[PDB]
């Protein structure tokens, strides 16, 4: 229902001149508003739990402590969980658990799978370590 | 030295009006900078980085990984872990490795446990479950 934009504003994460700067700077660029924002000062977890509650993803805060289930990686071929930045990592009530690098996947990811998912967002270095040790380049 | 409310600001997680605001209404309840901006919306994660930094402790994202070394959480009485919020959980270096629960709690745990040490800190449910794995029944 909300934008990026409007989201970050209600959280008070942003300001408004900092938005429209960046919504300016975008009508002659045509970059990713997040990245624009997050360019200009924009924390990027910040930006990211923004994109999560957008998309009803669960923010992971870490993957550390996530052991990835073997029988969960084999639903997706390695060359699709990196191609669509996903990484199935267990079973909970019959949905498969899939941590996203991208919100944006979340809906092709879903068609994929074809079955009942719950869905996470993790920072970009955090999703790396947990693809690695679900996909071992093996 | 950067005060909690300018190490915010600096990152962008609260606006400069928004930290006069919260230091406005602590005159009057006295509260914690840290609780008050949580409650306007601040990340208890960012909150618990910042503080972090801010006493040269490194924050632990998560502790469900460690297991606790026995030798190292003899250093402290379990009384103690549990009134100074510190757990003891390994040794690197010659150092010892201590996960506190409230940053302000460094300088008194430093100097009870009189040896090198390296600090870490967790969030509060993370922390408790760490204490019951190093310091059961
Ligand atoms: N992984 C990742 N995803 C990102 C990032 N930035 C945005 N996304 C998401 O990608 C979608 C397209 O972003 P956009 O190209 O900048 O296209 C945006 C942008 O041009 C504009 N926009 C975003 N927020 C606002 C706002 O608050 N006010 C106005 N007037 N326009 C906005 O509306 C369009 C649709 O925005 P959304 O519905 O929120 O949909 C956005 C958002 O879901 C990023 O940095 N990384
Ligand atoms: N466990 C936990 N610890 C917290 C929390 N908030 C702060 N701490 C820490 O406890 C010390 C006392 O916080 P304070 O009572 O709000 O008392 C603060 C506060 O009244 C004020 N203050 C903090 N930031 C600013 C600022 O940016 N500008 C101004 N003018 N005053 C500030 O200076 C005093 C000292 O602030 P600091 O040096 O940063 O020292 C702070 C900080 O290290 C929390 O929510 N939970």
Known sequence: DLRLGEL???????????????????????????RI?????????????????????????STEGIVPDPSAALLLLRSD???????????????????????????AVAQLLNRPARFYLALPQAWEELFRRAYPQK
Do not use: C, M
């Open 81 to 107: 969980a990196l191609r669509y930045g996903a990484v199935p990592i267990g079973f909970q009530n019959g949905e498969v658990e899939v941590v996203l690098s991208d919100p944006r996947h979340k809906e």
């Open 37 to 61: 924002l997050v360019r200009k000062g924009l924390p990027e977890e910040a930006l990211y739990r923004a994109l999560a509650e957008q998309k009803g993803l669960e923010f992971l805060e």
């Open 8 to 34: 970050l504003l209600q959280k008070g994460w942003i300001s408004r001149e900092a938005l429209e700067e960046a919504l300016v700077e975008q009508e002659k660029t045509g970059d990713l508003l997040g």
